[PDB]
Amino acid sequence: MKLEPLLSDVPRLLMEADLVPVQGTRFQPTGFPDLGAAHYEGPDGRPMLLVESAQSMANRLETVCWDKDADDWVVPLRGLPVVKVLDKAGKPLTNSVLEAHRLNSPYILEGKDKTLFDLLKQELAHMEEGPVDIRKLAETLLKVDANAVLHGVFLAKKELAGGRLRLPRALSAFIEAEDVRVASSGGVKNDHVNPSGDTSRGFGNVPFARDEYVSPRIKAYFNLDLAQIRAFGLGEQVDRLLIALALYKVRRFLVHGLRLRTACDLDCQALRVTRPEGWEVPELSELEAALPGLIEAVAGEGRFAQPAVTIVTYEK
Amino acid sequence: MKLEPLLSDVPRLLMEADLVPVQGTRFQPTGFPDLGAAHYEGPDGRPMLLVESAQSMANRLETVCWDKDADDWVVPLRGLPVVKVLDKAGKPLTNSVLEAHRLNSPYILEGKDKTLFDLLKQELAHMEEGPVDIRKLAETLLKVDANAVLHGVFLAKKELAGGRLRLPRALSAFIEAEDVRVASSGGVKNDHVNPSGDTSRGFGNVPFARDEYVSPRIKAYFNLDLAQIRAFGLGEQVDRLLIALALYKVRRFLVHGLRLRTACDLDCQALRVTRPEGWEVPELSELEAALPGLIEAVAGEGRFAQPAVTIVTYEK
Amino acid sequence: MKLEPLLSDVPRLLMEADLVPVQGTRFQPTGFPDLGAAHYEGPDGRPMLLVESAQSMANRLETVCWDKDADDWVVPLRGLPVVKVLDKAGKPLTNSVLEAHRLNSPYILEGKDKTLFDLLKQELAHMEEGPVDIRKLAETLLKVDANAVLHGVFLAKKELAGGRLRLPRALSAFIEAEDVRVASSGGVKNDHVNPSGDTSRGFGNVPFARDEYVSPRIKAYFNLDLAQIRAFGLGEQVDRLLIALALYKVRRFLVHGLRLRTACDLDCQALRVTRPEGWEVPELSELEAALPGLIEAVAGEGRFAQPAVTIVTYEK
């Protein structure tokens, strides 16, 4: 199955998914720590809502590839390089796919003993001072992390070139709602106040309120930066690998990732491409069938480090 | 069509372009160091925001025309003069096009090797007393690098005739959003949720606030000062060269700098011209074809220094 | 229309022109760093800003005519009296029309040898004692420098009658903006060298701040006191000449001084007269045609000294 030729010169891939609630007619947006529901006024003079940020979408698209039941990739993706962190007793604390800021985690790259630290220093020493090459950085990163190449990292740690080394996203997505109405609701924790009726110790009839939103058009947008992955220039095998991996993430999220929140019950009504016009998207079973071959090819080209999975122990 | 009729008709060239966000309805403007988003109140009585600084637009219009990996211009521009800065180990640490201070860059004119310093002093000695001839300076800049002619230079060095010499930029451009509106959305760290929130160790939890804007009209403005370059009087063919170089830079940025921040991604809806009225801008393929011949013509006029490329070594 | 009808009638001529920025809304006003932008509160309580100083508007009105490469007046103004200072080599250091203090300077009337010093002293000896007469000084200036009459002079040298002689400006103009709102901005000087960001040596990142302004009403005022020149009484033909010259200088400044600074790029929209009311100002082509004939007439009266151009050298 050929897909990279149809995406070998186009600068970016745009995909748009039309969502609808599974049951009822309402949904719950993300509770930002300051404002809660981040509603805003649209350019056309109509109310709009950021259903959830372009970060939560990324963390979900990143979880749908991992399996905590084994602390390893799902079988189709098995073999992709990843650093995994163990405690002093050998039980797995965390791995770089679940961490937030990748190799910049405080568990990773910082601790009592640091193998991956000396690896990163040995790799990037030539660029630690002066001009930085995003190709030499992207290859060093792909050596030890197979998906950060889609989400970026900031090597803030001062001893690593003062934090000069940086790399932005290549895949991004978010959900947006048009013409949002509001519904309001609340309740009271009506525990009987016969033995105690003071809220200080949690008794009483304490009330609460919460808001709910109604929108006739919710959209999930996905954007893939083909130009930058070409600008890495690691090889057409790597390019087709990363395109297939991104399509895989999107399909799995779209099929069974749409319970974003307890009251956020969502369904997919139709996916379509926006740019390039007239293209066709692979099916999920076809990506499942292709992925292990493309990963094998890239492993045979030696771009991955060996062993693919690398282990580090965390303690102060 | 040929471009010299415009060099006869008018004193200045004015263009504007309608930008639209590629997806969604909101974007990330520049974060200025002192204040963040540079919003202000408009004379018409409506709020608006400066998307980015005009000198950042200049650095981008320069970036879209040079390849640091190859250490040479894009194919149409090749052969134009430039100075490359060498490291003691022979690897090119930078060049005066990549750097933003052009000849004034502290790595240039400084260190144990300063051949370009004398190549300027040879005529700065004439400029030391009495008046200053802008056409003579513009000639000696065209002799060294045709980009400085386009973006201006200040020769602050005391030995360089007391730092008397300056030249304002002929091409200027900026983007601003009218009637802007605000959409705020913060976030929090996922990782390290279970352990203590000791932010000062780095081993902690951190929430943050983030803000992005909405606008019904974003425009990029481009201004080319024909009067000043004409008042250099270096020729007509050199004027054709500079106007082609500028209009190529515009078209070559209009399809590359469409994204400026990782969350700020736009596309051009249309391009329009203001001064002169009724003129039609040439296509990018036409400039691509014409430009090498104009460069060779001006080289045949003997304006460029020989060799066109200059090498200088920097140590400190 | 002829000029002398209004000169016989009215004591002063008042005109105003309302400006706009050609692109965008912001502009850069004058920047005396001991104050920065000069802002103040108006009579009606509104905030106010003088955009350009009157003395600098005058220096521009005197720099718009004359030509540096031709080293002489523009063709319409050609033939009017002037003095230029030559160096030892023989290339003119200082035309007097360009210089700040006009007929008073360390270059003219000061130096190892000086002819013009005696030429003025002879004509001012009878003004050394008793009351000074404006008519005699105005005659002497009109024979030596026909433009210094409109801008005024102060002969501070104690050798010239203790410096008692002085003459106020006849033409005054300035640019003023009303109901101003500020628009702050900034930037950073980036760097990419290997060793260190020593700002004391010019390396490393260095931020900076700048302030721009906007206004819904900005205009330039012009004032010419016909009473003052009528009080000089050099003649009706001389008055007609000076009125033509002033009008011409304004009508050309309006299409050559708009680019006051690198970031201002103003643009005139309309021009209106305030006193005399009901008058119609001439067009630029008419003054451009008429002016040489009036210079011929006044030369025929013998008011201009012969040779019209005075040559003098300077040596310490």
Author numbering:
A (entry chain F), B (entry chain E), C (entry chain D): 1 to 316
Provide passages from the article that reported this PDB entry.
Here, we report the composition, structure and function of the type I-G Cascade CRISPR effector from Thioalkalivibrio sulfidiphilus, revealing key new molecular details. The unique Csb2 subunit processes pre-crRNA, remaining bound to the 3′ end of the mature crRNA, and seven Cas7 subunits form the backbone of the effector. Cas3 associates stably with the effector complex via the Cas8g subunit and is important for target DNA recognition. Structural analysis by cryo-Electron Microscopy reveals a strikingly curved backbone conformation with Cas8g spanning the belly of the structure.
For this, the size-exclusion-purified assembled complex containing Cas7, Cas8g and Csb2 in the presence of a 72 nt crRNA was used for the structure determination. Seven interlocking Cas7 subunits which form a crescent shaped structure bound to 42 nt of the crRNA that threads through the interlocking Cas7 subunits were clearly visualised in the CryoEM density. We built the individual Cas7 subunits using the AF2 predicted structure as a starting model. A beta hairpin emanating from the adjacent Cas7 subunit is positioned along the phosphate backbone of the sixth base, generating the kink. We can also trace the 5′-handle of the crRNA, which loops back and is not bound by the Cas7.1 subunit. In our CryoEM reconstruction, we did not observe discernible density near the 3′ end of the RNA corresponding to the Csb2 subunit. With seven Cas7 backbone subunits, the type I-G effector shows pronounced curvature of the crRNA, reminiscent of that seen for type I-F systems.
